[PDB]
Amino acid sequence: GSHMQIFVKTLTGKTITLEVEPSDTIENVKAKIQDKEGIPPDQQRLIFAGKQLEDGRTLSDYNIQKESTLHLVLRLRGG
């Protein structure tokens, strides 16, 4: 019900601040990158410390707390 801020930084070096819970879910987080920069969860990919972030899991699962900085892989496969 609250909103915590996390820094999901693209391979283009741009930082996307989301407003979700650490105990929310990764599926939600990636939907929120789409809510910020306007790129869908298909064309972006979530990775922290070299591990891929699975949709069904949470930030807290993958050792990601609030205000953690992780990497975002742009694909732009749609064209």
Q: How far apart are alpha carbons 67 and 7 in whole angstroms?
A: 6
x/- letters, 5..44, toward another protein (CB under 8 A): ------xx--------------------------------
Per DSSP, the residues of 45-74 read: EEEETTEE--TTS-TGGGT--TT-EEEEEE
Span of 23-31, 32-40, 57-65, 68-76 interacting with another protein by CB under 8 A: 68-76
Q: Is 75 in the site for another protein (CB under 8 A)?
A: yes
Size of the site for another protein (CB under 8 A): 13
Q: Per the structure block, which two tokens stand in for 44?
A: 């972006």
Number of CB atoms found within 10 A of residue 60's CB: 15
| Site of interaction with another protein (CB under 8 A) | 11-12, 45, 47, 50-52, 71, 73-77
